Design an enzyme around this catalytic site. Structure first.
Site, PDB file in Angstrom:
ATOM      1  N   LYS A  33      37.828  36.667  51.118  1.00 60.47           N
ATOM      2  CA  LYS A  33      38.942  36.200  50.302  1.00 60.47           C
ATOM      3  C   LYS A  33      38.966  36.893  48.943  1.00 60.47           C
ATOM      4  CE  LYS A  33      39.672  32.593  53.262  1.00 60.47           C
ATOM      5  NZ  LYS A  33      38.760  32.963  54.375  1.00 60.47           N
TER       6      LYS A  33
ATOM      7  N   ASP B  59      35.601  35.631  60.009  1.00 57.54           N
ATOM      8  CA  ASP B  59      36.184  35.075  58.791  1.00 57.54           C
ATOM      9  C   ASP B  59      36.453  36.173  57.766  1.00 57.54           C
ATOM     10  OD1 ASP B  59      37.147  33.370  56.889  1.00 57.54           O
ATOM     11  OD2 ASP B  59      35.259  32.316  56.533  1.00 57.54           O
TER      12      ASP B  59
ATOM     13  N   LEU C 163      30.656  30.717  19.572  1.00 56.02           N
ATOM     14  CA  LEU C 163      30.144  31.340  18.356  1.00 56.02           C
ATOM     15  C   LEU C 163      28.630  31.210  18.212  1.00 56.02           C
ATOM     16  CD1 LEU C 163      32.855  30.722  15.651  1.00 56.02           C
ATOM     17  CD2 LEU C 163      32.415  32.677  17.125  1.00 56.02           C
TER      18      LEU C 163
ATOM     19  N   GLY D 104      26.588  30.432  20.448  1.00 54.00           N
ATOM     20  CA  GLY D 104      25.975  30.998  21.635  1.00 54.00           C
ATOM     21  C   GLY D 104      26.072  32.507  21.739  1.00 54.00           C
ATOM     22  N   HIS D 105      26.888  33.111  20.881  1.00 59.45           N
ATOM     23  CA  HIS D 105      27.163  34.543  20.944  1.00 59.45           C
ATOM     24  C   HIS D 105      25.878  35.357  20.855  1.00 59.45           C
ATOM     25  CE1 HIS D 105      29.594  38.250  20.213  1.00 59.45           C
ATOM     26  NE2 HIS D 105      30.482  37.557  20.905  1.00 59.45           N
TER      27      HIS D 105
ATOM     28  N   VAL E 172      20.946  29.642  24.587  1.00 63.07           N
ATOM     29  CA  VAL E 172      22.130  29.024  25.165  1.00 63.07           C
ATOM     30  C   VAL E 172      22.625  27.883  24.282  1.00 63.07           C
ATOM     31  CG1 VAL E 172      22.887  27.474  26.985  1.00 63.07           C
ATOM     32  CG2 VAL E 172      21.779  29.638  27.567  1.00 63.07           C
TER      33      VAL E 172
ATOM     34  N   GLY F 210      26.269  25.234  23.243  1.00 65.61           N
ATOM     35  CA  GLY F 210      27.609  24.759  23.542  1.00 65.61           C
ATOM     36  C   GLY F 210      27.635  23.295  23.924  1.00 65.61           C
TER      37      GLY F 210
ATOM     38  N   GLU G  98      26.059   7.925  49.748  1.00 64.91           N
ATOM     39  CA  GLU G  98      26.571   9.236  50.131  1.00 64.91           C
ATOM     40  C   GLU G  98      25.927   9.724  51.417  1.00 64.91           C
ATOM     41  OE1 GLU G  98      25.004  13.584  48.930  1.00 64.91           O
ATOM     42  OE2 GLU G  98      25.959  12.425  47.327  1.00 64.91           O
TER      43      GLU G  98
HETATM   44 ZN   LIG Z   1      20.731  13.678  48.519  1.00 62.49          ZN
END
Ligand SMILES: [Zn+2]
Ligand SMILES: Cc1ccc(C(=O)NCc2cn([C@@H](CC(=O)NO)Cc3ccc4ccccc4c3)nn2)cc1
Ligand SMILES: [Zn+2]
Lengths: 953, 956
Positions: free
Chosen positions: B856, B853, B295, B297-298, B318, B320, B69
């Site tokens: 948005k 710019d 549920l 996580g509520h 947390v 899920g 990459e």
């Molecule tokens: Zn990297």
């Protein structure tokens, strides 16, 4: 053998600690003379007192005798240059002034000790051949009129004159002393009178040698001083004037049992009780007046004040004998009133008379007098050495009342207890012999009478016999007791031996996060006294106006409660001074060191465990509400100063911000504020006097401990101790701030020329220039141009920043005053380039002798060091460093500094000026000024400007 | 009809509020493509996602796919200049980046709307003929090692990899993704590998067309975009690689019922509960994971957390489904621990299992699904318009998982209620297949194992069967109930008509001693949303460290209390944000305006009548103590930034001042503080969105009234409203402040070249210069000289003052980094003189495009206005005025500005530098200048006292 001397005394009783040497003598012409030889003094001084004053004014020319004193300064025959006198003193580091009481006109000066002859010669000419220049007579009339104007809206003067105007109109006492342009110019012309020859007539008539007393103090030996005085003053003529007496009291039967309702200028509430009494001066050896003054005036447990306080009627009381003239005196009892007290005036007076009645039934108490005799004896024994100028002047005055040998002891020592004279004076304090005056805003519109000279609004009433009778039958009150034995009288006067590791300057002997302690054992004066100074730092004292208000109220409330306890100590020559700073609190304890830690401990622990009486709270607050309000009635020149100080400091709350926040301070609130305030502190102290190093360490230890124990105090963080900065004005900027003074129909101005941070070079550059222009400024702006009575120049120092300032209070508009000050500034630049080298070194010399002037009392040396400590500069040898540097500056050096900082078009000219306008408002060539930038908002102004750095320790 | 296109799919379903137009298609070579046509957009963007990632790394060269990459940016055959890509985007107001997850490598960029083609041509070459220059491979390897180094002492990363290294070692999941200098250079050389051709081999092997998805967003018509994509991407070769799958879960039985005790870097206390589950992705239309996530996580009344919170064992929870890879997923429940909670972990887990049992006994609830489906449906309908870069990137990723017609709706809209899948996933969350991890400082020295790549020290145990059994027998607990109907679900979405006296910018519609109100009715986006911003000024919030501490603690406590109530709203797309500033308090309420005034009302009312639970007080305090302490373990460059900000502001309390002052904050002292704070206030607000002028005034008055009534609030005095100043450094001065970072073995530096006050001129001078050096700085200091992974330049703005700043985190000492930065600055001075006039206007245009710019989404327009309001500058038309002035600057204007403010011997150069040192410390390069002798700062206070302070800026 000398025929010019009629009598020498040569055994002048003095303090057993007094090292100066004294000889008294009488001249052939009858002038009484005291000669003081102080071989060490840095300034010499002399004074003359003429036993004629405003009381002897001609009735058609009011203020003549006052006017005359203004004139004697403006030139004599031997020295005819109008300001030759004034300028000689300025060039040789001297200063002068005079005053005019009912029976005295008193002239004094001081000078650099080696130019005493020159100064004294010029001074003696006042009494021989004054000019009274016709041109000068015309000018200085304005100075006087401007002076009267200053006093017109002053409540103290208005009352002063109102009393005079309610007794016998035929009596000289009724006279207007000050005089103004109407009484001294306009009306005398109207009546074809020639004032200049009236001045001469008065001077020739009354300034006779037999009515004069002279004191001369110098480094010179006693014998030399003799010849010097004889040379200069034996020529003075002896018209052998009879000394005026005023045997008939101005208050007669018609003027007694009278009530007065008076409208004030400020919002104040006062009650004035007055008793006409015979002249008690000749009974000075017993002083029955002082005795009854001490009792009626006492503020201790069971006193008259204590109870009027309890009833919530008064806050302060002043009582005792009041000077009048030869032949009459007064006894007064004066209290301020609360809201409640105003509605209980008849009651308050009743309380006054039953206390007086208490005194009567107990009879004179010798042990009380005996106490008073002994305290005086000590106070006199360990007297602080006085500044030469005020010493000579004061003594010149009292030479008229005492034989030469007795003058030093005369107004200090009591000798004979005389219970018969006491009951005789106490017999005069009766309702059928009372005058009552009530001063209050609540008489607005309800008055029907106007006093001429001040415009005072009042109403006159006879006190109903029902009321007099009810006072006359004043039974005893069991709330009134005589004072107990004063337990704060010092007994140990031992001067502790000078320690081995003792220092010339204060040493830092304790340096903790909690506290920084400066200490110096007194090595100069050796009196059983000490000065304990404390600055408590807390940010919470000034964080916002509401807090600032509480910071104030809290200390005021504290002082109030302590007062009963502290007053005794106050009398015993041990006193304290406590009020809030913008950084926290300040606490000073001065006086005899013996019982000093006892008071200090009580103060701290009482502040740390303080609990508030709410009745006291509501009163003190209301009084403070008023106190803030009343600033609008202060003088214009004080407004200018106030605004500038507001304009130029980084953070500063205004009266209006404070007065609004004050209608918000509640009781349970101020109660929450205190412990929070004390929770975190830093303490910087300077202990100085007859104390040893570990004694000092012990004291602060006590201060800390009582705070830690009772108030759980812990140190501030170093980053939290912030001092404020001065606004940094731009190169060539000019800002103007405009305001109106709604009370005084006079205008004021301060003009400020900011230079740079304080440093040895920038300091002396400023200080020297200020010196050189100092006298010319007064001469140009007042003596010649007569812009006003008040004209001031000199340095201004704040927040480690400095600059030159002018202050003028004037009948003319400010916008005009500016051009005249800027017109002079040029006058100086031309006159400085012309002034010779030898003239220049005179000014160098003048500043130098003046800066190096050695402190005469402990208290003054303390202030000098304390100055360095609060300023955060800690430069204890400043005077030697700076003067040494000063002596190296050239004439050119000054010119550069000016044409670089001050001149109308200096590259670095920083100028802000404050214009205070009169109640009703819209010669050398004045320069072209830029268009100033008008300030509309004090905060917005500061936001758009940089702030200076703080100075380095 | 067309040989290059295999499918044009169909009509791509979109929100009716979405004005953008879409066409999806698949190419001949199998690249799935979405085309977005926005005739209004200011920046165009494109992205490509390859469905290959770190999981497919060779076992002998760990981190290769990530490294690859990094490499694709550094030159291709048609465009071989090492930074041609990077530089083209900078000159045309663009920016780029990429990331590498387990199964994805995703590349995105944005550019000025008229240079889409140019940018995209250069971009497509990544996937056709990259160079992988031997010289660049040697250099950029350091960037990766520097990247990994950054993460080594980071607890979140340490945990992430520790997990991977405790499952099946044979499984691809166990692989080290990032890679470093050892794995990518040292060891491959050791083993005779030629890395450049391993890259080529990998690239050609896996970067096949059938594994790619492409999104392009521009102004061009859908037809224009079509031809363009076909042109540039039909060249991509189709070696037709089978898509990797991982059916065998990395966490087998030998890895279940296992406990892990882990030593953290910062002082944190955490519990991690994990369940291996099948890959639920294909069930996206029902999403059983989200349901159980929702549920467990509520945080509402009767929730699992509520009870754990009450027992004083945990503070936050947390739960899920957690992404894994194709073939496996995880279900987690993760809580932070209190002091007490750490000793009741076995209990806590039981409670977790007691809740799961409750869920089992109640069965699948349709009305819950019914609710979740409706919230999503609304969330999608009234979705905020996204910035092009993140939007293209996002879709490129999910094009691999959904039919073209559904890509926009797929992750939002629920369709099938599936009680069986719910009950099926619920069956996997059982004690007999659980993993537990406890992270705590208290395992220090008691560990016996070390994780290789991050050095993490832990200890592994089998969970005793006595404990498993006792969890398995989780009886019902009567403190746990399911949530009731969400009462905050919006129903009124009516867009109020645009008022007659409505304005382009926010108007000051209320200006009293108590409060100053800025208002604008939304004229651009027309969504049933509104933004309510409030700044409460009190001097007592920052008067001293102790008070600052209380200001914080108090709001933290308030938020804690409200949380149970507020959570309901939060799910209903309405949330609040409340935190203390150096000036007082800040409060924002954003989301659907419908039930918005109810939340605001409750916040203020409870803020004004707050009653403190003492147990809550003492716990939050403990956490804050830790939180302050833990700053010693943040990144070196954050330390640098922190110290500078401390140095250059008139008033600023440091961490050590605060934590010292904090052991002194008692419950009585704080309870007294709160009424003090609220007693006198001033309020500057911006109300902005779908509300009318009179609605706004009502809201702002409501706030005041609630304060006045319940807390007897009175106005501040105008002079009490003080903003702080920045320190004014002297002409030609250079100051250095030195500190050591005791945790990270990397050093940091910030260099600040203070210029002057902000002004239309002084702003654009800096910003334009910054623009010109923006990319070159990154190229020289990182790509060429390889000083570190983090290299930042740009403007710095504080207290109305500005200047240029450099931030570098590096292996080399700071005193050296200084030398290289100063060396770079001369390079710029010469290259500005060399650069053509037309090249210069490229940068002006670029900055202009960047500054002009258009926002948005509403929230972004709000931020621009709110920026002006707190800054005390109130310059709402800034971007047009300032850009207008910019377009008039000449090359000379900049040269002069450089020589007088920035140059090594500028007459007016103000330079302060912060040097943060590594854990243990004190040629063929461009000429570094001889530097002045710095004045070393020894005391932060003493320093500030001896310097002037700038003025504050003027409004309008
Ligand atoms: Zn990297
Ligand atoms: C630098 C300087 C130059 C001259 C003098 C001076 O003494 N001028 C003559 C004079 C001044 N005064 C005094 C006393 C008085 O009111 N007598 O009726 C007037 C006076 C007193 C204090 C002042 C303070 C600030 C500004 C002007 C003042 C004027 N009386 N005659 C004083 C200082
Ligand atoms: Zn006078």
């Amino acid at each position: 053998n000398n025929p010019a001397i009629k009598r020498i005394g040569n055994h002048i009783t003095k303090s057993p600690e007094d090292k100066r040497e004294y000889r008294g003598l009488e001249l052939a012409n009858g002038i009484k003379v005291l000669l003081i030889s102080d071989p060490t003094t840095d300034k010499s001084s002399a004074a003359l007192d003429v036993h004629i004053g405003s009381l002897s004014d001609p009735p058609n020319i009011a203020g003549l005798s006052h006017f005359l004193e203004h004139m004697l300064f403006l030139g004599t025959k031997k020295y005819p240059k109008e300001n030759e006198y004034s300028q000689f003193l300025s060039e040789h580091a001297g200063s002068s002034n005079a005053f005019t009481s009912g029976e005295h006109t008193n002239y004094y000066f001081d000078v650099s000790h080696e130019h005493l002859e020159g100064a004294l010669d010029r001074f003696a000419q006042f009494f021989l051949s004054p000019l009274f220049d016709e041109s000068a007579k015309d000018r200085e009339v304005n100075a006087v009129d401007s002076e009267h104007e200053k006093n017109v809206m002053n409540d103290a003067w208005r009352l002063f004159q109102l009393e005079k105007a309610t007794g016998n109109p035929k009596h000289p006492f009724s006279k207007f002393g000050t005089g103004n342009k109407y009484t001294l110019e306009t009306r005398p012309n109207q009546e074809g009178i020639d004032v200049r020859q009236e001045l001469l007539k008065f001077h020739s008539a009354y300034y006779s040698s037999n009515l004069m007393a002279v004191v001369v103090l110098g480094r010179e030996s006693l014998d030399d001083l003799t010849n010097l005085v004889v040379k200069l003053f034996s020529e003075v003529e002896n018209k052998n004037v009879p000394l005026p007496e005023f045997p008939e009291h101005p208050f007669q039967e018609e003027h007694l049992k009278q009530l007065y309702k008076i409208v004030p200028i400020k919002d104040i509430r006062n009650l004035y009780v007055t008793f006409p009494i015979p002249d008690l001066q000749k009974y000075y050896k017993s002083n029955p007046g002082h005795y009854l003054g001490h009792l009626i005036g006492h503020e201790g447990p069971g006193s008259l004040l204590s109870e009027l306080k309890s009833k919530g009627w008064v806050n302060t009381l002043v009582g005792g004998q009041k000077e009048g003239a030869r032949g009459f005196m007064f006894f007064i009892i004066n209290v301020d009133l609360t809201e409640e007290g105003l509605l209980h005036v008849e009651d308050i007076i009743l309380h006054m008379f039953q206390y007086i009645q208490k005194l009567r039934a107990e009879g004179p108490q010798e042990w009380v007098f005996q106490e008073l005799k002994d305290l005086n004896a000590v106070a006199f024994r360990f007297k602080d050495k006085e500044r030469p100028r005020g010493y000579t002047s004061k003594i010149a005055g009292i030479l008229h009342y005492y034989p030469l040998e007795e003058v030093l002891t005369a107004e200090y020592l009591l000798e004979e207890f005389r219970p018969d004279l006491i009951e005789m004076v106490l017999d005069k304090l009766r309702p059928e012999n009372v005058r009552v005056a009530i001063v209050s805003k609540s008489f607005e519109g309800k008055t029907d009478r106007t006093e001429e000279w001040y415009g005072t609004q009042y109403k006159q009433e006879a006190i109903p016999d029902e009321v007099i009778k009810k006072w006359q039958n004043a039974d005893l009150n069991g709330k009134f007791k005589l004072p107990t034995k004063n337990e704060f009288i010092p007994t140990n006067f031992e001067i502790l031996p000078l320690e081995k590791e003792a220092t010339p300057y204060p040493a830092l002997i304790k340096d903790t996060a909690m506290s920084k302690l400066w200490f110096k054992q007194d090595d100069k004066f050796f009196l059983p006294k000490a000065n304990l100074n404390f600055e408590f730092f807390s940010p919470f004292a000034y964080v916002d106006p509401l807090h600032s208000n509480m910071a104030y109220l809290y200390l005021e409330l504290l002082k109030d409660s302590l007062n009963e306890y502290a007053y005794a100590a106050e009398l015993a020559g041990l006193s304290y001074d406590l009020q809030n700073t913008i950084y926290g609190m300040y606490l000073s304890v001065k006086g005899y060191n013996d019982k000093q830690p006892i008071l200090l401990k009580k103060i701290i622990e009482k502040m740390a465990t303080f609990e508030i009486d709410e009745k006291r709270f509501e009163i003190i607050k209301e009084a403070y509400m008023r106190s803030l309000n009343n600033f609008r009635a202060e003088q214009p020149h004080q407004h200018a100063m106030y605004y500038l100080r507001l304009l130029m400091t980084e953070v500063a709350w205004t009266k209006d911000e404070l007065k609004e926040a004050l209608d918000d301070v509640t009781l349970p609130r101020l109660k929450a504020f205190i412990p929070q305030l004390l929770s975190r502190l830093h303490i910087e102290a300077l202990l100085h006097g007859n104390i040893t190093k570990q004694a000092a360490l012990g004291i602060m230890q006590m201060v800390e401990d009582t705070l830690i124990e009772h108030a759980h105090t812990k140190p501030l963080l170093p980053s939290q101790l912030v001092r404020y900065r001065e606004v940094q004005l731009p190169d060539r900027g000019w800002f103007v701030y405009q305001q109106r003074n709604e009370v005084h129909n006079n205008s004021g101005i301060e003009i400020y020329y900011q230079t740079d941070m304080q440093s040895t070079s920038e300091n002396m550059f400023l200080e020297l220039f200020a010196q050189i222009i100092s006298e010319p400024a007064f001469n140009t702006l007042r003596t010649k141009e007569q812009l006003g009575y008040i004209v001031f120049s000199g340095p201004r120092r704040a927040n480690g920043i400095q600059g030159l300032r002018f202050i003028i209070q004037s009948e003319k508009p400010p916008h005009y005053l500016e051009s005249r000050v800027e017109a002079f500034l040029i006058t100086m630049e031309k006159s400085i380039e012309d002034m010779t080298e030898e003239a220049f070194q005179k000014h160098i010399q003048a500043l130098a002798i003046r800066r190096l002037d050695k402190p005469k009392k402990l208290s003054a040396e303390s202030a000098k060091y304390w100055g360095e400590i609060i300023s955060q500069q800690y430069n204890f040898d400043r005077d030697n460093t700076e003067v040494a540097y000063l002596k190296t500056l050239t004439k050119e050096d000054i010119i550069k500094f000016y044409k670089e900082m001050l001149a109308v078009d200096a590259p670095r000219r920083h100028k802000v000026s404050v214009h205070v306008l009169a109640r009703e408002m819209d010669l050398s060539q004045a320069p072209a000024l830029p268009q100033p930038e008008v300030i509309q908002n004090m905060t917005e102004f500061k936001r758009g400007l940089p702030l200076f750095p703080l100075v380095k320790p």
